[PDB]
Design an enzyme around this catalytic site. Structure first.
Site, mmCIF file in Angstrom:
data_model
loop_
_atom_site.group_PDB
_atom_site.id
_atom_site.type_symbol
_atom_site.label_atom_id
_atom_site.label_comp_id
_atom_site.label_asym_id
_atom_site.label_seq_id
_atom_site.Cartn_x
_atom_site.Cartn_y
_atom_site.Cartn_z
ATOM 1 N N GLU A 228 10.402 54.617 10.019
ATOM 2 C CA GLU A 228 9.223 55.480 10.162
ATOM 3 C C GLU A 228 8.617 55.104 11.386
ATOM 4 O O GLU A 228 8.594 54.027 11.964
ATOM 5 C CB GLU A 228 8.310 54.823 8.946
ATOM 6 C CG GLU A 228 7.234 55.909 8.640
ATOM 7 C CD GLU A 228 6.846 55.851 7.125
ATOM 8 O OE1 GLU A 228 6.304 54.596 6.772
ATOM 9 O OE2 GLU A 228 6.749 56.549 6.063
ATOM 10 N N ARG B 298 1.018 49.478 -10.253
ATOM 11 C CA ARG B 298 0.416 48.334 -11.077
ATOM 12 C C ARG B 298 -1.098 48.131 -10.634
ATOM 13 O O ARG B 298 -1.429 48.764 -9.552
ATOM 14 C CB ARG B 298 1.169 46.930 -10.834
ATOM 15 C CG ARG B 298 1.361 46.873 -9.122
ATOM 16 C CD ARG B 298 1.664 45.623 -8.968
ATOM 17 N NE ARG B 298 1.570 45.208 -7.291
ATOM 18 C CZ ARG B 298 0.534 44.972 -6.669
ATOM 19 N NH1 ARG B 298 -0.690 44.954 -7.317
ATOM 20 N NH2 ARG B 298 0.791 44.786 -5.411
HETATM 21 N N1 LIG Z 1 4.211 53.017 9.078
HETATM 22 C C1 LIG Z 1 3.430 52.166 9.272
HETATM 23 N N2 LIG Z 1 2.547 52.147 10.459
HETATM 24 C C2 LIG Z 1 1.744 51.076 10.794
HETATM 25 N N3 LIG Z 1 1.602 50.131 9.885
HETATM 26 C C3 LIG Z 1 2.136 50.077 8.575
HETATM 27 C C4 LIG Z 1 3.373 51.056 8.448
HETATM 28 N N4 LIG Z 1 3.820 50.559 7.146
HETATM 29 C C5 LIG Z 1 3.253 49.507 6.675
HETATM 30 N N5 LIG Z 1 2.312 49.158 7.714
HETATM 31 C C6 LIG Z 1 1.386 47.843 7.544
HETATM 32 O O1 LIG Z 1 1.826 47.027 6.659
HETATM 33 C C7 LIG Z 1 0.953 46.930 5.217
HETATM 34 C C8 LIG Z 1 1.952 46.865 4.117
HETATM 35 O O2 LIG Z 1 2.745 48.134 4.093
HETATM 36 P P1 LIG Z 1 3.577 48.274 2.693
HETATM 37 O O3 LIG Z 1 4.522 49.577 2.873
HETATM 38 O O4 LIG Z 1 2.483 48.537 1.655
HETATM 39 O O5 LIG Z 1 4.310 46.804 2.605
HETATM 40 P P2 LIG Z 1 4.196 45.914 1.025
HETATM 41 O O6 LIG Z 1 5.050 46.493 0.264
HETATM 42 O O7 LIG Z 1 4.955 44.873 1.902
HETATM 43 O O8 LIG Z 1 2.860 45.706 0.845
HETATM 44 C C9 LIG Z 1 0.304 48.322 5.466
HETATM 45 O O9 LIG Z 1 -0.996 47.879 4.836
HETATM 46 C C10 LIG Z 1 0.099 48.623 6.908
HETATM 47 O O10 LIG Z 1 -0.936 47.549 7.308
#
Ligand SMILES: Nc1ncnc2c1ncn2[C@@H]1O[C@H](COP(=O)(O)OP(=O)(O)O)[C@@H](O)[C@H]1O
Ligand SMILES: Nc1ncnc2c1ncn2[C@@H]1O[C@H](COP(=O)(O)OP(=O)(O)O)[C@@H](O)[C@H]1O
Ligand SMILES: *C(=O)CCCC[C@@H]1SC[C@@H]2NC(=O)N[C@@H]21
Ligand SMILES: *C(=O)CCCC[C@@H]1SC[C@@H]2NC(=O)N[C@@H]21
Ligand SMILES: [Mg+2]
Ligand SMILES: [Mg+2]
EC number: 6.3.4.14
Lengths: 21, 446, 77, 446, 77
Positions: free
Chosen positions: D201, D292
């Site tokens: 991504e 959730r």
């Molecule tokens: N594409 C992205 N660009 C920038 N930061 C990201 C991106 N994806 C995730 N993050 C950072 O990581 C955090 C957690 O991502 P997430 O996909 O929700 O992972 P998890 O399942 O570990 O919570 C997000 O709140 C953001 O701060």
């Protein structure tokens, strides 16, 4: 913590006028 | 804005005022006695001044000591909270003499509303209904006294003009004990309030104590914030207070509130007050007014979202009312329970060290108290150690939340009246709502 | 180790007047009763007498320093 | 309502579920491990069943054990809360097949939204914009991978499809380390989640993590409840949340809320879920959805007034949503702080007995936690010991309230991240608001 | 002595069948290899084998009473 607090003395240079009368 | 203020009180209200000050960025001076050095707000205050020995007549009722603390600390206002000198007109005028800001009404206002004989007259002049009664102080003209008693209708109650806290009240059923009841009431008034004046009023037997909270800035503006229902009393001392009062329709609520606001405008009131009414048959009957923040005020804060103490500070600082009448919206129902430190089966205060303490949490539960594990409750002052306010979208949710939060609360080492609150919560008639002021004594039956 | 404590909230002064002599000093002793210092509150200068005859072991609060009720002022013997 | 439910969790969320159950007149079964016999919710629960030894992999992740506990006690539902088995589609299907209601989404929806690639595809189908990226699982075509990376623009991030908790994520700056980073992230995913699927991504350098709360009853109804700005994070784990997000005008709120509600209706969602996003240049870019109840839901509860867990319980019982979209009103601003039992500097867990503890209180301060004086924090589970939520009429009031509440909290006998939270509260940029997701790490100056 | 505890969560039974003889009984001793009780879980009647041979002092639970993990069942002296 706030329980283990030691009183620190007041700042002497603080004036609040009270009328003489 | 106020540069600095003195919190001339102790316990829970002192914490409330200190925390509001901290929110508003006001410097706090916490005057305490020599036995109050351990209070939570004293240890959380910016500056602390020991103003006297343990007894209240020498520490907190000492106006010169509080003024001297304000002077040396360079404060600009004094918040009396409730109790002690909150309703003391001498304190008001003596604080205003020395260039300090009294957070509260004027001295003349406290004098006028401070004696019920004059407050009733002012309310009748302002159109606020009042209980039929002597309509004046009682003299020695016994024939006139009995004629008045016959006119109003028995039973009758003799109430001291300077009475407070539920004392100095005697219920008289007939002429046989009228003179003796008056004599003993006068003696108790002399021994308690230094004012032997008394007056006779009709004794309603099925009322509901409903009180209105009003905010006025002393500039021609005044608003009313819902009401309360303090009908759960023991010896005229409230135990459970809730807001809004069940069964008070919005039409009646507005009808009483607008009249209360107009009455506030009439006497040029300032700050936060409270009108106390007896509710019966859809008719309100004024009994007294509290010219100060009330103990049970947190219930009114949790249904309107309006912080009353911050409003008091802003009004004292000179700012006008920032809340319009139409902006006040009642959203929910709050129920409060006073947690005293006394023997539950004898209502005698129980001082002593608190060995364990665990306050309840949760969504919509507020715990307002100064105690902590290892806090030695002193014997010199009143028995109240905290308040527990639970809030919900309706009365049933608030009561269920209260029942849950009362079990989760632990207070060991002292005899506290938590079980009484638990059994009051489980009472079926209370859950129904609309009980009368005499219901709790009937339930206990002794 | 007798301690004489201030009886009121106010400002602690040594000299009864701003340009006068100090009431006492460490060393020189004091009798059972006599003026020892000044606490001013709401104006109305108040003089703190002494209760114990003995030597002035030490004075713990300087001139112009605010004092509270039962603030340790001086130590005598 | 549900006759009885099983709380297959521990800690703060277990208390949140227990309290919601008690308010609703629902019996509770609290399943615990052998090391969690002193938990507050275990000691307050109606029934207690030990399901396994201390380690999580044997007690709180033992689906057969929880099913057995629900069977013997005659439960009719199982609430997973968050973590553990909340997002375990196998748990959902097994629970529903065994004959117990699963309080949450359907197994099919958990499977669909858990796979971040399928979730992104469904969001694109339903009209929810997404971050530019691989648009599918990564293959062996390195030429295509680098072509896509060049087209979207470096840097890029490799994220495990089944990843969680901020682990299994690697940022790639160029084509040099793309293959090695992908391989090592796949190996880490194999070690942790037993699933090596990964996807690429675009990496936004100055986003604001904004998430929407959605309630849908699974019968064609769904609503959105404000948002939350969880920007303040360290090591991809949130520390301070707030709601509503500063700077998100009501127009954008309604826009994204309508899109998310439509997406919930289309994919047949049921229960309470959260749609995470990344905010930049006034445009949201979906990243993942949480199927959730979220750890930081209390802020939404406090600003909207809707008890989310009670809504979950009601939906699970089949009752349709009783709250219309127009009836959801945001009133104020809530700021939450997570309190962990860890070194404030080494951020390592610090298990141990809690010798003293005095939780904060006052107006508009909620303390949600399970610890008490004498509790021995076991080392086998997560390091969070409580959450602290403060609500006010605006951001500044809430932050001042938070500062007071943090100053008032005592936790001794372990090392807790309270000073770090105070530091974050005192940060000028945080008070101004609008900080990016990388502000906290840069604040350490390393 | 030695206490054998349930290794899972389920209903406790002493007779493998609704109308049959108990696996063991108080008094009569048992050996290392033997089944003492039944812990039914999801209609899967399991058997519990002790680890120390000795005289069965007492059975601390009753048939039909649900048990939990690490629940004392039988004490053997
Ligand atoms: N594409 C992205 N660009 C920038 N930061 C990201 C991106 N994806 C995730 N993050 C950072 O990581 C955090 C957690 O991502 P997430 O996909 O929700 O992972 P998890 O399942 O570990 O919570 C997000 O709140 C953001 O701060
Ligand atoms: N006229 C009355 N009729 C019936 N009850 C009364 C009357 N006056 C007072 N009471 C009872 O006593 C309580 C306290 O009365 P109040 O005048 O406020 O005295 P205090 O100054 O002691 O609080 C009221 O809430 C009510 O329950
Ligand atoms: C009252 O008006 C404040 C000052 C009054 C004068 C006195 S004389 C003793 C103290 N020393 C000094 O310099 N000012 C004080
Ligand atoms: C399945 O529906 C449960 C049936 C329980 C049968 C078992 S056999 C051993 C126990 N004794 C008895 O009478 N019933 C139990
Ligand atoms: Mg009264
Ligand atoms: Mg996430």
């Amino acid at each position: 913590s706030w329980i283990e607090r030691i009183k620190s003395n007041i700042t002497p240079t603080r004036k609040a006028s009270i009328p003489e009368g | 804005m106020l540069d600095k203020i003195v919190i001339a009180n102790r316990g829970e209200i002192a914490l409330r005022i200190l925390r509001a000050c901290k929110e508003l960025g006001i410097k706090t001076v916490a005057v305490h006695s020599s036995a109050d050095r351990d209070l939570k707000h004293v240890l959380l205050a910016d500056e602390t001044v020991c103003i006297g020995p343990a007894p209240s007549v020498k520490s907190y009722l000492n106006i010169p000591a509080i003024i001297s603390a304000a002077e040396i600390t360079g404060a600009v206002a004094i918040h009396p909270g409730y109790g002690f000198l909150s309703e003391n007109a001498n304190f008001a005028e003596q604080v205003e003499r020395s260039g300090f800001i009294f957070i509260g009404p004027k001295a003349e206002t406290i004098r006028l509303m401070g004696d019920k004989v004059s407050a009733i007259a002012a309310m009748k002049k302002a159109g606020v209904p009042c209980v039929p009664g002597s309509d004046g102080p009682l003299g020695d003209d016994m024939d006139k006294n009995r004629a008045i008693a016959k006119r109003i209708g028995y039973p009758v109650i003799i109430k001291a003009s300077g009475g407070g806290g539920g004392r100095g009240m005697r219920v008289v059923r007939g002429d046989a004990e009228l003179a003796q009841s008056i004599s003993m009431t006068r003696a108790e008034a002399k021994a308690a309030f230094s004012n032997d004046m008394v007056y006779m009023e009709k004794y309603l037997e099925n009322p509901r104590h409903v009180e209105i909270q009003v905010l006025a800035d002393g500039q021609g503006n005044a608003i009313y914030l819902a009401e309360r229902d303090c009908s759960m009393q023991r010896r005229h001392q409230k135990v459970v207070e809730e807001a809004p009062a069940p069964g008070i329709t919005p039409e009646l609520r507005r009808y009483i509130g607008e009249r209360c606001a107009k009455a506030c405008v009439d006497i040029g009131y300032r700050g936060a007050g409270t009108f106390e009414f007896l509710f019966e048959n859809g008719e309100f009957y004024f009994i007294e007014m509290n010219t100060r923040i009330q103990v049970e005020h947190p219930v009114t804060e949790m249904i309107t979202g309006v912080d009353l103490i911050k409003e008091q500070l802003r009004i004292a600082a000179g700012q006008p009312l920032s809340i319009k009448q139409e902006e006040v919206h009642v959203r929910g129902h709050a129920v409060e329970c006073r947690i005293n430190a006394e023997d539950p089966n004898t209502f005698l205060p129980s001082p002593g060290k608190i060995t364990r303490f665990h306050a309840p949490g949760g969504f919509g539960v507020r715990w307002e108290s100064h105690i902590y594990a290892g806090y030695t409750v002193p014997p010199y002052y009143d028995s109240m150690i905290g308040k527990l306010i639970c809030y919900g979208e309706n009365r049933d949710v608030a009561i269920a939340r209260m029942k849950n939060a009362l079990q989760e609360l632990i207070i060991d080492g002292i005899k506290t009246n938590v079980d009484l609150q638990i059994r009051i919560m489980n009472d079926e008639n209370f859950q129904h709502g609309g009980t009368n002021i005499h219901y709790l004594e009937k339930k206990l039956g002794l | 180790g007798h301690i004489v404590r201030s009886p009121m909230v106010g400002t602690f002064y040594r000299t009864p007047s701003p340009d006068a002599k100090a009431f006492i000093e460490v060393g020189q002793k004091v009798n059972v009763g006599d003026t020892l210092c000044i606490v001013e509150a709401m104006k109305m200068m108040n003089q703190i007498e002494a209760d114990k005859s003995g030597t002035v072991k030490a004075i713990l609060v300087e001139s112009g320093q605010p004092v509270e009720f039962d603030e340790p002022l001086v130590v005598i013997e």
